[model samples]
Target chain A: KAVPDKFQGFAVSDPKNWNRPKLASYERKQINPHDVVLKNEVCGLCYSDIHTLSAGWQPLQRDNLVVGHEIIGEVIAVGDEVTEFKVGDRVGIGAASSSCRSCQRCDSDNEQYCKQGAATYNSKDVRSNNYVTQGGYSSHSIADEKFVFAIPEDLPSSYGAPLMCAGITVFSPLIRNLGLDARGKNVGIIGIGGLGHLALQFANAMGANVTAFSRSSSKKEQAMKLGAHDFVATGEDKTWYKNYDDHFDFILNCASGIDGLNLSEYLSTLKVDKKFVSVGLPPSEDKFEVSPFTFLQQGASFGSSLLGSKTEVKEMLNLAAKHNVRPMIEEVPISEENCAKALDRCHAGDVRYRFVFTDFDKAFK
Target chain B: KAVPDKFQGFAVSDPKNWNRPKLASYERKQINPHDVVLKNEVCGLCYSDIHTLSAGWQPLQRDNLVVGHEIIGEVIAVGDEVTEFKVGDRVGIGAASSSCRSCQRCDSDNEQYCKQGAATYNSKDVRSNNYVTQGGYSSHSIADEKFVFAIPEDLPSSYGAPLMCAGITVFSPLIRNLGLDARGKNVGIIGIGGLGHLALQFANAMGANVTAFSRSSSKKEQAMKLGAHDFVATGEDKTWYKNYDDHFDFILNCASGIDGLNLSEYLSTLKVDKKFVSVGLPPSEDKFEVSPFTFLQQGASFGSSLLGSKTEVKEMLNLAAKHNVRPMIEEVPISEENCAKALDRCHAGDVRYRFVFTDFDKAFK
Candidate 1:
């Protein structure tokens, strides 16, 4: 196999101080026996990218890093022990790249929760003596065969790209929290953008009574069109608090900018012994002031989850394919000229749903 | 049956300003067909009683009320429709007195979460608007058959008193969160006081490996004697946090005060996807400042549970009887004189564990 010595990619020289990423050529690491190299095709931008690029979250691990995880590509090379993939196979990678395969979580179906788990970018590979793991904003990217999933045969790469991250982020929690037989269960999706839209479709496909919770009534019509059984304008309605008290069986909070949210009011919507899983990032100093009285009286819980595991990611992809769960995305040409604007638009929440970068050949050349 | 029109009991005329309760003759409401009158044998004082009496928690339901829930007595008389209890049967009542039987929570064995649920004290009976439900700090108490449990024949009334509230508080969460088949799971209990000590016994009896977390090493030996496999001195040791990182599968926070404890450090002891149930009543203003990053990375949850249901209380009593699970209590005479002293001592944490009020005849006379 002819391996390229240098690959074209967009990278932040100092991620801790990064505003706009720079397009450059970077060296590739020697592929291990269990590794597979892919020629990048489509990569979806995530809100976490904003947090990672500017070092918003604490404990910044990498400086010069290429950050993107919702990767969909065609396999260009496979290592000696890589039986799962070969040249020309369509594949994808999500948030997690590697985990200690011998851990209890890795042994089970939840390898994403392993203590030695490494994200796709800004993480150190323990097996490779702490080699810096770069993400999918590049011409060619390499990952362990275990973390690289085979894209469903009929699913388009563009659709499969966001499914690797946003789709699974909502899907895993819905299944984990509400169980496989979520039929007739009440599900509420907070925030009608990105992950929430996919969650509405998935929950609806699962035969649940889905309700979309947005700050205003502006998105009410759109949310109902996207498979929501009902729409709740949280701030607009005066009776929303009393009317929806203890209403939902499970709520998937996909809303970003977690500060200043009416968390107590959100909790009031959950039924007895139900759960509200927050998949969004909140500021460090801003904590949810959950009343102990509410929890005791309602028996509801608050929990959060990271990315889905390899098994869950595969299951999610198959489910998405089977249920026609495609993310609403606006495709942008992947090039040095368009990359910065695409990121800026995504940051500004100007995209209708998600922004999937395509035309990798033009950027690489 | 000679039904008393008036009963001798201790009354807090103004609960918000109450210190020492006074013995007085109070008029009793006419019992409904579903009610059973009890000749109170023993009443266990709970920390929540102090909080309720002093109007610590907001929305004080009653200014003049008798506060006690963990009541154990011989059924002196039964109304016409009370089939569950006979005239001579031993029965008990816990935190809850009545709930709308048609509610979802009531239908599912979780009547404690019912919105229309009535507590043993301070809560008004929704069935009859004129009647106020007073607790067991009296010669006789009346409760609906649905909320009353028939105590196990072999279990002594003294041992069964604390089981009504403290025992079920921990047992319900253990079975619900950890499941009845918690064979090899690690369980941790915080605060070795009234509720915590019993939680240790119940979690231990359920075939789990139990660990008790206290603020100091003082209770290490006693906790071990009470079925704890290990004891963690949280503040005494600098390495406690690191040593027990991701250790417990489930933690029951029975500590009363909600402030100044290292919640994050305590969270570090929980394994991924584990739960920490807070049954303790903390101050409203001082909430647990949980970092969202911690929850996302660890996948741990924070939840709270009120008292258990009638079914759960029955199961707990049976289990306690079978396993010989008993709380350590310092029995005090149930006189108006000793009652004040007991409440003061319990508030100061001077008791060995719990304080059970016996010799009720003296108080009634």
Candidate 2:
């Protein structure tokens, strides 16, 4: 089995100097019998990428880490043991690259939480010692067949790219925690960015009455246009949320930079026995302090979900296609110069919603 | 239509002077047809009583409030519209006294979270504008039919008293948050006093593998006897819980003195996507501070459950009877001085588990 001598991708050697990524060549490893090689078509830029490259959470565990998980591509090669995906099949990978399929979490369809789970980037593959798993910032990436998902034909590659990570982060809990049938349910989405917009569409498509929350009133019309039945300007009034207190059946928190915000206000909107799920990772050291009395009195709960499983990813895509759910994305050409500029704009919150890199062949070839 | 001229119950006019209850006579209010008068038989003293009487949380909304909710008694009288209970029926009342049954919460069997729901003590009953709701630390109590529950024929009155509040507090979340069937699930109970012990038994009866978490190793034998399959002394080792990281599917936090404790330690024991429920009310100013990353990475949740709803209480009692789930209770003779002493003892943690006031007739008649 011959592996590619060099693979083209973006790499950040220093967290402090991530303004530009070095378009470099890296030695590609041979794919395992259970792995499939995906030729990247589009990859979504998530907050996690900036957080990782900038070392916002902690120091980067490794140098030259390629960080992109919202992967959308076509399978160019399949391992001997790979049965689900074949060459020419469009596929996607999320935050999780591989997991011990025998664990309880894996058996229960929560492989992202498996103890032996390997993240899509900067994670060591347990199967191959000394080999760090790279992500979709490159031309092609290899992942276990279990983690590779076949994309729905109706969904465009670019629109389905962010759904691999952002889509499943909110969708999984909507089905699992809030129940699959959202018919007549009051659902709320916090933040109006990449994740929240898709969440609104998904929740609306599931038959839920959707409400959107934003710090400013600027996104009111935009959010409503994106399927939100109502909008709440959180920064408008001190007690703005009091009016909608105990109103929502389930709330999806898709807001980043949520520090110093009135979190209790958001939690108060959930009806009794309802759930408030956090899929968006807040800024560093943004602690959540809630009195038990808040949730206890109303029988409400606060929880968080990671990315979706392979099965859930497929379900999400099916739901997206059935509902015609399309993500609002700004397509950036895949190149050394374009990737650096898009990341800088993403960090500055200048994009409309999400940034997806296209034209992989021109850059990689 | 003749209302009692006087009724005997313990009360403190001034929270600062709550060393002893006056035990004076109080005029009874006119009962509505929806009200059922219960001749108090066995009223279990709960921690809430002390907190309310001493104004440990905040100043009492009103003076002359009787403070006990874990009530067990025989129905002495029924109103014209009260169909659930008739005279001589064995009934019980927990933390709730009345609720607008027309509201969403009431219709959904969660009346305890209703905005118009009235607590058993220190609450104003909407039916009687001038009267404040009184609790079971009295010779008799009149409550709406909706809030009263008929005790199981087999469960003892004394043992069933705390089930109204303490029992339902743990049972509701076990069913609601964790689901009805806990078969093959791992459940952990923190604290082994009134609520934890009962939670252990309930979780065990639900076919879960129960683990008990305590500060001391003294309760190891007792926990096992009460249906715990394993015990972890949290205080024995600073990082003792690290051994069982991601071990529990559901954990009931029944320890009242959880302030200043490392909550993340207990949270670590929850399995991925599991829940940690707090049933016991800690200090007012005490807050839970958790970094989202801890729960986010594992897909865990933190929540609280007030006492169960009326329907849930009935279910809890039925389950208790079916599983022989009896709470450990210390029967104390009902007298003004004895009641005062019992509350003090309970505050000091001197009681075995819970103190149920007996001989109500001897003290009030």
Candidate 3:
């Protein structure tokens, strides 16, 4: 197949050092019956995507991974069995794209947690026995019917892209841990970046008393404006957390700087039987002395959660629709050349909340 | 009101060195309503009692701090309203001596976790606010009806002393993590001393295949004898731990040394949703690290637990009764000189499993 016009040659950068990239042609694939050509109407660059742009995480044994898990786009084609969508149907995809459906986890709608799960990008699809499984970096992309999600008709494509990944990351935890309809439970979002901003909106929509913790005081207004009931500048407002000692029912730690974080103190903020979950993978090494006795004393648990499952993603988006929760995002048109610029700007922290590349028009070009 | 022969001129020795204790005799109080007076039949010298004798602990905050907590005795007096036990009741007392019934924790049967909970020694009474709290080292002791337990008729007093404290420490986690009738789980018992030995038995009896891990191979025979199905000597079995990675359902870490232990590797031993609980107090600073991604991938939790609750105590002892769980004990007469000797010998690791102070008959002489 001949390469399309919008599809251009670009260097696939090493995640550690951006300057070091391998030149590769955008040899995009054709749409299959089970697949749809998504002119990425809007593609969201997430922290996970940025992780792939930086020199790949060494200790984790991840390398040559592509960017973009929080993907949003418009359907230019549909599979024969694709009753979920038609032409021009706005859709999204998250970190997980494939899994063995025979597993118990898959049967339970927890495909993200399936042992044989595959990432959206830079990961081989074991079921198909294909090594060159691609992501949403190019003008067009294809995935199995199971991993696709519908961007609610009410929400915009720009908002739905990041919502697919970051939205579900925070949303699922809120709904699962906080009991979305249950009242009087307070939730804390630790970090005002890509995850935290969306988490604030979701937590507030879930009727939780949401608090945002960030290192910079500059992000306070933005956090509260995004639906956080309260904002805490961890660097300046040391006493703000004191009043919250063993108070919060759930805390979503979204910041990536795991170093110098007082995890014990963070745990102290949780109420009995509550949980403090760390989902943000900082670029640096995260090592801390966790006191199990303290966790037992408070009856609190410390754990981490992956991005939401496909079912959870649909449910979360439905909740987002009902609550009118939208992430602060900058939309970019999806194409071959835009990938490098969007990634470079993302690395520089230029995106307010998230950057989504619109692909509906160009993916069909 | 003169001091009795059994209460005469006893000195507390610091665990760091075999030197005389700093404090002098403190006044003992009269028994209250819901109180019982018992002759100390035999008191188990446990590892926690050793830490209680040490210098690095939170300091000798109170005067004349008597440190023994694992106590077994025949009740000589019962309060008017004491429905649970009678004057001739054979009872055991663990770490907790008293708690205010009005506290939320006490109401929930978590008196050990109560803010105003009193220890057997070195703690001020919540009601009296006095440092006159005495322990089982004395010839006679008094406690509220709630903290006193009726020992199983079949179990020996000396053997049951350790069961009151050390046994419950291991037993609580076994039940909480593995369930009451966990028949097919693979459990690991770390540090085969006071608590680990009991843990091995409890885990094994609950139908778990118990693995004992120690720094040395010396404890292998004793651990296997005590019901450990397998042993992992860290010094020699370098590859054994990595071989069965992701095999354990629960790990009861009883060692106080927290540094340099491959916690991530230990965590890797647990399957999804499994837990690692530490019950021992590491003398020095103890630390463990969980990368944000590591904790998320397995859905595992790492936490610590203090001594079990009183209700848990009841359940554990009853479980002990059902399973015929017996603690190994070495007894010594309650001579003026031997209490110190037994404490020292227990500290020196001379006792096979536990050292119990016998000969309460000397108090009446």
Candidate 4:
């Protein structure tokens, strides 16, 4: 019956010096009947974390906020009413924690979209006396049983953690647009970084003819090795995309800095009445200025996706493990210095794909 | 054997005098083996005709251009290769006339989307000897067998004509997104004019709970009569839409003045991961200025729909007949002065719903 009274994690005190995080401690909310506490095992770095730390999304909601959501952990404690999970079970948490489970969206399997939903970090949950929620960049994490996902037994923490956020963002839309059984569908994944690399692998495993798009041929070999059947260097030849005009059934945009991209040109690559969905967010100053005729010409759709729901997340984990969909990662220990370094390097686009944090036991030793 | 060598129609000579269309005549090209020539019976006035006449699209693609594509007519002659129709066959033609029937798009049942395709008006066919195309405003209209559609026996000419353009524009997207069998789903129609009135009917007949959205309460009675189950007078109360946030499973924008409408507010009304498809084209000067975050926040899509394919049009015609999906239309005689008045009235939003041209035999006599 031993549990730490206080939890310690890295926090950003000032917006200007966001990369220089420091060790800070905060108290977790009282465990509700539906709550499950987790001992952090691994956490994957995502663009969302950078946006939070650099004040790109919004200035830090709190000075002592821990910002990471791609989490993999083992259950350390379960509330009295928690029946689905018990101590020693491995699980994962993504961008959201819980919602008013009685709402229409929740009943429709879209709990993350509930208006009363709470984010995994830097969010205050009014359902629990304005409890300040902390994410996975800590010694322990807490979540409601409805939002917790069981990582597949064959999937490693390094791979399972990223799937919680990056993996789900891409996987959710693919299954939603193309039928869950997309045998010969043409799926285009732009941006060969964290999300795109995993997206290429997942789409290929789901029986799609996955195509990867990058600025240059530098990632061509890497992308193909990750399961891309075809690769295109868009920046090298401006008109290379013309060869595949109206070709894709569904195009998943995973690139950052996509504000300067040709919205019209990319749309023409999709087949008539298809969609070009994106999970990438570019600079805030940049906006999507397109004419209605652009989508009307080929009857194209341009949209975006967020993280998957609890059911979808579980299915993704099972399918990923069955198909051996593993994410490429570089492990960094969980420490004030190491966390800051990872955040800064990721912001600078210095990492190959993902930077997963580990060595939790050594950090406290 | 009775087809005329030359066709007569109203033409917009100058952009400034768009409403003052004058009578003009042009010679028809030599009939191709797959061509079907029809004696014009009725046609519908659409916003696209206004765009072309008033330099809103391009400044008169040709001096003698006739701006009408929604045609319902009876075949007078057919070439040897025209197997679909013969003399006295009632038919219709939408915005597009024909595409290369041998391309991938044509093979996939999306022939209207072919790059080599020609429009019903203001376009030239490269497959022919640079043959110029004219639309439904003429005494006689010529088209390839592939572009000709059979008018359902139960459908009236006045109702069938509008379905060629405005009808298919809305119907194609509704069926494409919601599936041909959308029972009990929520559908929002943003405009109560030509397309919206029909969309409300089509969606309602498709078993969706259709909602109609107009600026004021002026159209509430008409929208209800057109099969709208629910009506929201958007201009009557500013916050009225807030009550229906995240409500619709599919929202179709049929308004022309949507440039000033709240993109975020309308998008908020759609259920998560659903589409906000538009067939309404606003003033060319007004662009869709929205942030990518707007779509990502709700997991929504913003896209568009063109005219339906030949297969969809055929199916729509049959379904419209079976379900009594009749359009609200006003009749106009086919004369230079009458056509001009109808064009000017439709532009000023003076018509009840649609202005369908008739009295073709009386006009010629």
Candidate number of the best TM-score? 4
If both were scored by lDDT, which would come out higher, candidate 2 or candidate 4?
4
Model 2 spans with C-alpha error above 4 angstroms: A27-30, A76-80, A130-132, A152-155, A178-180, A237-240, B1-3, B17-19, B178-181, B237-247, B283-290
**Please, what is the whole-model Cα lDDT of each candidate in the order they appear?**
0.81, 0.81, 0.70, 0.83
Model 4 spans with C-alpha error above 4 angstroms: A282-290, B1-4, B152-154, B362-365
Candidates sorted by TM-score, best first: 4, 1, 2, 3
What lDDT tens digits, residue by residue, belong to model 4 across residues A219-334?
99999999999888888978876798767999888854565677777787888878888885642534556567778778888887777778888778878878888888889988
Q: What is candidate 1's CAPRI-style docking category based on DockQ?
A: medium
lDDT of 2: 0.81
CAPRI level of candidate 3: acceptable
DockQ for candidate 2, please give it: 0.61
Q: Rank the candidates by DockQ, best first.
A: 4, 1, 2, 3
Query: Candidate 1: misplaced stretches above 4 Å?
Result: A14-19, A59-64, A282-291, B13-19, B130-132
Scanning candidate 2 chain B in windows of ten residues, the lowest lDDT window is B282-291
lDDT at B312 for candidate 2? 78
Worst 10 residues of 4 chain A by lDDT: A280-289
Best by lDDT: 4
DockQ of each: 0.62, 0.61, 0.40, 0.64
Clashing pairs in 1: none
What TM value does the first chain of each candidate achieve? 0.94, 0.95, 0.86, 0.95
* Candidate 4, true inter-chain contacts retained: 0.74
